[PDB]
Amino acid sequence: ESHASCSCECVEEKIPIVTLKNENAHFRYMKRRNDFALEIENKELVRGLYLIPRGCDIPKKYKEDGLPVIISGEVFDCSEYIKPWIKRDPVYFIKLSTIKKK
Numbered sequence: 001e002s003h004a005s006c007s008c009e010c011v012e013e014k015i016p017i018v019t020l021k022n023e024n025a026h027f028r029y030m031k032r033r034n035d036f037a038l039e040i041e042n043k044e045l046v047r048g049l050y051l052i053p054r055g056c057d058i059p060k061k062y063k064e065d066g067l068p069v070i071i072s073g074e075v076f077d078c079s080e081y082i083k084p085w086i087k088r089d090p091v092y093f094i095k096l097s098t099i100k101k102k
Contacts, residue, residue, distance in 0.1 A: 008055025010078035068102035
């Protein structure tokens with residue numbers, strides 16, 4: 001179990017989606033973005049959307065494409081992005097509390 005700290009806060013309103021506890025996931029390297037996302041097993045909770053551990057400094061040992069991991073944290077969106085005029089990358093954000101290699 002590696003504990004983590006995440007500080008990329010929402011500007012307008014945090015919109016909580018779901019809280020994950022000991023969730024199976026895989027890290028996915030995102031070529032265009034050039035960042036790592038998490039794909040979780042329980043697709044029904046996030047519509048299959050990848051989770052961006054935004055602002056979280058992840059230990060280098062987890063940054064491998066396809067690595068199975070076990071994660072906990074708060075999945076959320078930000079209302080500033082929920083606007084009729086906003087075109088967005090379809091993702092949710094996650095504030096990670098723990099990550100473990102599966």
